Amino acid sequence: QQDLVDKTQKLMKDNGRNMMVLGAIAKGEKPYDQAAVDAALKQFDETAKDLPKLFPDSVKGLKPFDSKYSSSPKIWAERAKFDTEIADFAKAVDGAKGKIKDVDTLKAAMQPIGKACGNCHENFRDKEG
Numbered sequence: 042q043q044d045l046v047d048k049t050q051k052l053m054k055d056n057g058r059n060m061m062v063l064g065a066i067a068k069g070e071k072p073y074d075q076a077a078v079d080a081a082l083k084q085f086d087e088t089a090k091d092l093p094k095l096f097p098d099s100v101k102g103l104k105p106f107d108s109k110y111s112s113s114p115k116i117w118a119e120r121a122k123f124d125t126e127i128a129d130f131a132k133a134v135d136g137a138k139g140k141i142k143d144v145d146t147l148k149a150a151m152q153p154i155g156k157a158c159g160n161c162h163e164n165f166r167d168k169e170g
């Protein structure tokens with residue numbers, strides 16, 4: 042409880058930390074790695090296996106708000122759809138593991154996995170800054 046809002050923030054923030062390389066390549070940096078993404082890849086699953094848990098009513102809004110977080114309170118309602126959303130996300134990576142191979146594919150594997158990325162965002166992520 043003491044440190045949860047962060048534990049989650051870092052967990053979700055890690056998504057980008059791991060995608061770092063996946064990004065550079067995506068943008069057009071470094072002659073790709075694959076092995077570097079491999080990890081950052083399986084990282085999407087794991088992170089998507091400990092995310093649907095650190096979402097108490099102490100870090101939502103209307104009191105538990107910390108004027109920083111960015112997670113609509115509809116995540117407690119759509120808890121179901123919320124999971125099923127981050128559920129496939131872990132399946133997308135599972136497949137990306139074998140799928141992934143090059144860069145041209147990264148964008149291909151980044152189609153589904155990237156779905157729960159922006160989907161889980163626009164669905165549960167009202168970015169305001």
Ligand code: HEC
Nearest residue numbers: 049050053056057060111112126127130157158161165166
């Ligand atoms: C649900 C199916 C998710 C997947 C898969 C990913 N994200 Fe996410 N993200 C989700 C939520 C509910 C939220 C809000 C609460 C929380 O702190 O997680 C977020 C937030 C972000 C942030 C905000 C961080 C900040 O810099 O202020 C970022 C940068 C982020 N999301 C990025 C992102 C990326 C790039 C993902 C895949 C590579 C990704 N997330 C997966 C829900 C879900």
